[PDB]
Design a protein around this ligand. Sequence first.
Ligand SMILES: Nc1nc(Cl)c2nc(O)n(Cc3cc4c(cc3Br)OCO4)c2n1
Length: 223
Amino acid sequence: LHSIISSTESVQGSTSKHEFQAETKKLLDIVARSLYSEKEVFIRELISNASDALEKLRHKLVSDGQALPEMEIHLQTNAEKGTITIQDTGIGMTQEELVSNLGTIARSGSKAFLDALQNQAEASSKIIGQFGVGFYSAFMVADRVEVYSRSAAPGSLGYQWLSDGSGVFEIAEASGVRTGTKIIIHLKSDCKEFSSEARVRDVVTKYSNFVSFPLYLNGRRMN
Ligand SMILES: Nc1nc(Cl)c2nc(O)n(Cc3cc4c(cc3Br)OCO4)c2n1
């Protein structure tokens, strides 16, 4: 087996509170309404985000003149805790990105995204991914979301990022965060199926061969 996901992180700083941008909750809601009928697609959304993070790390390392490290995407299920977790070893998120990325669309203007979603020229799931709000689909299956991220940028600290998706998120420095991003989803009462290894395998195997870097489920290679 080849696993990297474990409960290694430790809170080692006090908590900073951040309120959602005014429109962010509206956009969270519209993603959830759009994707409910195929709610399992959140896994593909987060794998796509992880792949994007690995590509960003690739280009950093190409310009740095350095080797490619273990560049992987890992899924973990925990039926006892009612969680699904995804961890990538990609570029990770800086403090500034953890503060600002959720509200990017709200701040820059949602018109283009909402127009695209309305026109339905492609699958809603694809549009949502393309506009960079695939992470919004984490919330639609979660009672709460628990994120650990550390940027590959020099001097970057590791952070815990928590939210129940309602209107606030909280950031605290953490020790033991691997470069990249880990997202722990505490699943909603109607979404417990995604804490089943068999169910997640069934869902992901339909597209796992389309993933460029090694993809693992509970330590087992999927591609
Ligand atoms: N996996 C991976 N990796 C990197 Cl580098 C990412 N950069 C990103 O913006 N995302 C999606 C994302 C992750 C978040 C967040 C907001 C957003 Br929009 O707040 C808490 O964590 C990323 N997701």
